[PDB]
Amino acid sequence: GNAAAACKGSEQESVKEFLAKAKEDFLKKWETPSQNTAQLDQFDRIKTLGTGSFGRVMLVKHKESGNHYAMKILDKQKVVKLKQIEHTLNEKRILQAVNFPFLVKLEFSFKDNSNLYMVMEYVAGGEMFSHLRRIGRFSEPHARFYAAQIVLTFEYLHSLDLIYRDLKPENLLIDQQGYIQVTDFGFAKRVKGRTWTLCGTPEYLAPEIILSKGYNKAVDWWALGVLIYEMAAGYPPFFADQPIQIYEKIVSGKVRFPSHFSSDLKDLLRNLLQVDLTKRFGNLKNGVNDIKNHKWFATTDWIAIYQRKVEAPFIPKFKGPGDTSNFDDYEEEEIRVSINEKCGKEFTEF
């Protein structure tokens, strides 16, 4: 950091070395993943923090230590029925291998007759989504702070040949220091070439996903453009009542900016929300540096962000250990475990 501030570009070799070491650490865990590191009876289930099509996330309390965790519970039969086996195996294998300050930590994983379990560190601050909708919109410095963390996170993830594919305020939690932690790796994939799966969230899909083209990591950079827009405007650049209408707007290319957007913000967004892949920022010869060197990020100290030395725009209210006040209420359902093993072969490596 000190060098980067003193002489811009001098940190180049150091960043390269950092990523090289981070890749070595990742690959060791990637090649030999951890398995069966806890069991269900070691936790007390308290409250649901969020729900999905084939599972849910619960606040649990580790009986022996007293620590609180967010436990993702996935129904094996539902995963198979929805054809999500490989994606779930992707999620767990990647999560147990990664290590970055802006990614939620996988603490334990295990399975039983009925379910798959991923025990994550509990982030009590709630989703960015909740705060964003309530406040309406973030100021540009506020949005910039969050955006910078995503830029670094994608720099880290893309260096490991990982594509994230589900960026949205719903998947971004705010910690006790006011910093972002990325959650939900359900669509994350380790891929060197191109890939074809239609997945993500309608508002955040790049046009090449929509048009069944085959795509690469450039889709995460498009998604970043959508995120920054939504944070600063209070609404997405492409919205409608139904997904078809959203997809039509994305493929037209036309984006309108609120009058309060700065010239620098509009310029960055034009380069991120770019249909032409040979012109989209993050996908050019200089890669992520085109984004980091952009005028909108001129005030951003990139290393200081990584070191978490920058004062956050807001810190969420903390009421005590195991407080769920920053999370919405959900319908509670009893976690049932069958006496017969379901889908054993499909989930052998979990």
Binding site: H87, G200, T201, G234, F239, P258
Partner: peptide, 20 residues
């Protein structure tokens, strides 16, 4: 306003992830 149009839309709540 665009804001009013967004608030009146059916997609201001949590948006589910999609796949086929």
């Amino acid at each position: 306003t665009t804001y009013a149009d967004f608030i009146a839309s059916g997609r201001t709540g949590r948006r589910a992830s999609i796949h086929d």
